[PDB]
Design a protein around this ligand. Structure first.
Ligand SMILES: Cc1cc2nc3c(=O)[nH]c(=O)nc-3n(C[C@H](O)[C@H](O)[C@H](O)COP(=O)(O)OP(=O)(O)OC[C@H]3O[C@@H](n4cnc5c(N)ncnc54)[C@H](O)[C@@H]3O)c2cc1C
Ligand SMILES: Cc1cc2nc3c(=O)[nH]c(=O)nc-3n(C[C@H](O)[C@H](O)[C@H](O)COP(=O)(O)OP(=O)(O)OC[C@H]3O[C@@H](n4cnc5c(N)ncnc54)[C@H](O)[C@@H]3O)c2cc1C
Lengths: 115, 115
């Protein structure tokens, strides 16, 4: 019941996926070379400091198997959605439909259910 | 009432301070030179992509005025608490007592109110 407590692994995960998907949703459609480098490196550095060891190793192996595609906002928001679905699958959670990621993390649902 | 909606600036901020303070709380007490460099750069890259423009410019000016101290976990968790209090003050919110940051973001309150 006490809200201002350290978050657990699941709470830290929800915070972290919200931060990552939100950063992705606003990344440029046409990023410069340096922004593309900087986002890849951000993701790398995120995985280095993520404080759940099991999460982070798993994750660093995932990233080795599937490198951040930061060429454009489309590629990068989708890449990150595919990444997050691998973690969902690993954990027995259903796939998120990646075609909804702009709705979910930038624009809101088209039916107006977020307004 | 619909929970799976894009977060607003305040919601994105709570997610983001939770992610940052949590990363800090678990940073090493004796980080290697490369970890020290990597955390400074992480913070820099975070400020580059943070998607609230007003938040980010403000923030990039703050960081120019007061560089991330990543020499140790003590210095870095405190630095980040001081940073977050400047944003609190800017916004008319009261100071967070930085002496509580291990309790709040790693260990839980000493009275056991998080157990
Ligand atoms: C980088 C990272 C690695 C992690 N590794 C582990 C691990 O190894 N083991 C472990 O137990 N936990 C791990 N976690 C935590 C875990 O993924 C969940 O965050 C936590 O279990 C809470 O799950 P949840 O059901 O609340 O939804 P979350 O997975 O946290 O998702 C939050 C919301 O995002 C939306 N969403 C779901 N999937 C996608 C998607 N593919 N794309 C866009 N939006 C989506 C949905 O609205 C969902 O409610 C990791 C978290 C992160 C950020
Ligand atoms: C980097 C960054 C820059 C931002 N810039 C702006 C801006 O320019 N303008 C704007 O309107 N909003 C900005 N925000 C959002 C803003 O700071 C708040 O997150 C948002 O207004 C919600 O505030 P809150 O009252 O819910 O608590 P938050 O400030 O989000 O804090 C969440 C919790 O952290 C704990 N806490 C509070 N202070 C500290 C501290 N100093 N150290 C450790 N723990 C603490 C408390 O438990 C608090 O409830 C920024 C957010 C971030 C992450």
């Amino acid at each position: 019941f006490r809200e201002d407590c350290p978050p657990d692994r699941e709470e830290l995960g929800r915070h972290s996926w919200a931060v990552l998907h939100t950063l992705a949703a606003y990344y440029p459609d046409l990023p410069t070379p340096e922004q593309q480098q900087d986002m890849a490196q951000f993701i790398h550095l995120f995985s280095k400091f993520y404080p759940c060891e099991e999460c982070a190793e798993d994750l660093r192996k995932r990233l080795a198997r599937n490198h951040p595609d930061t060429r454009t906002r489309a590629a990068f928001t989708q890449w990150l959605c595919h990444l997050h679905n691998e973690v969902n699958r690993k954990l027995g959670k259903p796939d998120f439909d990646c075609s909804k990621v702009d709705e979910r993390w930038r624009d809101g649902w088209k039916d107006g259910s977020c307004d």
